[PDB]
Paper text:
[name], an integral cytoplasmic membrane tyrosine autokinase protein serves as the master regulator of the biosynthesis and export of many bacterial capsular polysaccharides and exopolysaccharides. [name] comprises a large periplasmic domain, two transmembrane helices and a C-terminal cytoplasmic kinase domain with a tyrosine-rich tail. [name] regulates polymerisation functions through cycling the formation and dissociation of an octameric complex, driven by changes in the phosphorylation status of the tyrosine-rich tail. [name] [name] serves a model for a wider family of polysaccharide co-polymerases.
Here, we report the characterisation of the structures WzcK540M2YE (Y718E, Y717E), WzcK540M3YE (Y718E, Y717E and Y715E) and WzcK540M3YE_N711Y (an additional N711Y mutation) corresponding to different phosphorylation states. One intermediate, 2pY which has Y713 at the active site, does not follow the YxY pattern, since position 711 is asparagine. Notably in the WzcK540M3YE structure the stretch of residues connecting the α23 to the active site is entirely disordered and molecular dynamics of 2pY showed this stretch of residues to be highly mobile. We show that it is binding of the i-2 tyrosine to the tyrosine pocket (where i is the number of the residue positioned at the kinase active site) orders the tail between the tyrosine at the active site and helix α23. The structural and MD data reported here confirm this hypothesis, showing that the tyrosine most stably positioned at the active site is the one immediately N-terminal to the phosphotyrosine (or the engineered Tyr-to-Glu mutation).
Numbering used by the authors:
A (entry chain A): 438 to 477
B (entry chain A): 535 to 704
C (entry chain H): 494 to 582
D (entry chain A): 17 to 64, 85 to 243
E (entry chain H): 195 to 243
The structure:
């Protein structure tokens, strides 16, 4: 449990990619859509 | 950045706008790694390059998608000087001619952080939209791309997130 | 001792310089004349590299370009271009 | 930050957390079910002080006398090829065998490092067996003594299935004394009484 | 007992220096603080000497 928790914390604190259109809208960029992944 | 979804979004949007009875033209101005003709069913001769270099006319480049409903213009043969080809005035002549015969023209472009083709094309584009991958790209990269389009004289309308997945942390 | 924009036209640096060329084509509008001056803060920064490569990348698009090497103290443009060193600036 | 974020992250990475916890728990289960059991025996001595006796009990004199009496310098190990063969053999209900050895003397190579000579004895039947020291194969029989090639060996009452193998090492007297002293402990438990508790831990419940 | 060609430094150090060297690595402890047991310890590079 401890090693899983610390690994998850490391991964969370090392991610930098976008996660929601709120981040792009903060800067002043109009997010016109959000296309989900197509499993097909 | 490459492999973000420019071709996916552009082609699907062209299809969804063509199915509503409006004529659509799809130009694949990714003269470096474009594969639209592979995805559409192709007569790979006389692409965009063969027109820009002057060895083709404006009529042999346009083809019909089978299960689509919109025309398309593939890149054709990979040239050695793409960014120097795209500056030719024949490109603007092609766009001006096409704008009078179609209801919509959608141009796919390479990334802007990698090459400068997008910023050359963006002068004649009425609207410009960026595509941002969900987890790969960053806010910093998108802001840099916006500012690099601003410097070159192209006003970006907005962004389009892509590759979204449902996360419980939201 | 040859132009990067000529020996290896598909290098990353030449792509960045083409981006700079497209930026300039819009920045250099409404200027009082068509003269560009590339300068710097400290020597060995890249003034000659950037200026020469930019001149090449703007010449390859069918526009006539003149390149003046006003570095009257340690300039070596004639060495990099192939020279008749008589009658300089 | 807030609790909602951390709960969401935990829910998102549930698969990784479960996998890591499961593999660690599996390793713990394997170790706890394969480790050789260690039994503990004890005794109580009445002293008619107790600090000098505590120091004298663990002296090399008494332990050496005990080792000479019980021939603890002849180490016999049942052979399993892997690091887990013994554990699985115990789990499968296999009965461990044993050999009673009363006399052993190896040629005592005594090189720079390996001061402990050793041989390998393979069980062929209830009566005879094979001996190999460095690939030299010899045949011996329980009962009659073996004195060949500078090797003297006596075997009594070998109890194992045929095909079993055993490492027989003649470790030095000092090493045996150190091994015995390492697992042997003495305590007073009263700090003034004549009561001394002696504890010995080992893997053979009767030995 | 050595192979031919070996060399050895032979020093006649003074008695006091030898005593100091021996005393430096030699230790005594009681280990019981009241018993008659004394533990003597000597550390050196020659296992038999
Ligand atoms: N929402 C999506 N769902 C599933 N696949 C996608 C999605 N978006 C893009 N792709 C696929 O991932 C690959 C990269 O997209 P593509 O636009 O073709 O490359 P690029 O962005 O460099 O032009 C493609 O094969 C595409 O089919
Ligand atoms: N992006 C670059 N990549 C590789 N070499 C470079 C780059 N920029 C400058 N240089 C090289 O480093 C040296 C210094 O640049 P240069 O412009 O000629 O000197 P200065 O700035 O003093 O006029 C040159 O030899 C140049 O070729
Ligand atoms: Mg593409
Ligand atoms: Mg210079």
């Amino acid at each position: 449990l401890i090693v899983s928790v610390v690994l998850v914390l490391f991964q969370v604190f090392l991610r930098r990619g976008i996660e929601s259109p709120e981040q792009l809208e903060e800067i002043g960029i109009n997010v016109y859509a959000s296309i989900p992944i197509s499993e097909w | 950045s490459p492999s973000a979804g420019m071709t996916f979004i552009s082609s699907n949007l062209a299809a969804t706008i063509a199915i509503t009875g409006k004529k659509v033209l799809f130009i694949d101005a990714d003269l470096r790694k474009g594969y639209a003709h592979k995805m559409f069913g192709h007569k790979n001769d006389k692409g965009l390059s063969e027109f820009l270099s002057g060895q083709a006319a404006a009529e042999m480049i346009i083809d019909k998608v089978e299960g689509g409903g919109f025309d398309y213009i593939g890149r054709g043969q990979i040239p050695p000087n793409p960014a120097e080809l795209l500056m030719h005035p024949r490109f603007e002549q092609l766009l001006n001619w096409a704008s009078q015969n179609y209801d919509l023209i959608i141009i796919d472009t390479p990334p802007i952080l990698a090459v400068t083709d997008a910023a050359i094309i963006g002068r004649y584009a009425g609207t410009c939209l960026l595509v941002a991958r969900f987890e790969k790209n960053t806010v910093k990269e998108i802001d840099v791309s916006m500012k690099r389009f601003e410097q070159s004289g192209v006003v970006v309308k907005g962004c389009i997130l892509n590759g979204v997945v449902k996360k419980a942390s939201s | 001792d040859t132009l990067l924009a000529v020996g290896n036209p598909a290098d990353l640096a030449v792509e960045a310089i083409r981006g700079l060329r497209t930026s300039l084509h819009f920045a250099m509008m409404e200027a009082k004349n068509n003269v560009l001056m590339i300068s710097g803060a400290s020597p060995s920064a890249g003034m000659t590299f950037i200026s020469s490569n930019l001149a090449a990348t703007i010449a390859i698009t069918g526009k006539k370009v003149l390149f003046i090497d006003a570095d009257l103290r340690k300039g070596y443009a004639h060495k990099m271009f192939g020279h008749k060193n008589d009658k300089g600036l | 930050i807030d609790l909602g974020r951390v709960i969401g992250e935990l829910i998102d990475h549930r698969k990784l957390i479960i996998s890591i916890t499961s593999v660690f728990t599996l390793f713990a289960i394997l170790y706890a079910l394969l480790a050789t059991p260690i039994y503990e025996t004890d005794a109580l001595i009445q002293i008619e002080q107790s600090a000098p006796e505590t120091a004298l009990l663990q002296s090399r004199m008494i332990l050496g006398k005990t080792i000479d009496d019980l021939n603890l310098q002849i180490q016999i190990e049942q052979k399993y090829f892997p690091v887990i063969g013994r554990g699985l053999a115990r789990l499968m209900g296999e009965k461990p065998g044993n050999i009673d050895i009363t006399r052993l003397y190896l040629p005592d190579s005594d090189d720079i490092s390996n001061n402990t000579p050793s041989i390998i004895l393979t069980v062929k039947d209830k009566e005879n067996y094979s001996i190999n020291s460095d690939g030299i194969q010899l045949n011996g029989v329980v009962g009659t003594l073996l004195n060949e090639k500078g090797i003297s060996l006596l075997v009594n009452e070998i109890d194992a299935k045929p095909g079993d193998q055993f490492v027989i090492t003649q470790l030095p007297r000092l090493k045996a004394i150190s091994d015995l002293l390492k697992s042997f402990s003495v305590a007073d438990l009263g700090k003034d009484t004549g009561m001394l508790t002696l504890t010995l831990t080992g893997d053979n419940p009767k030995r």
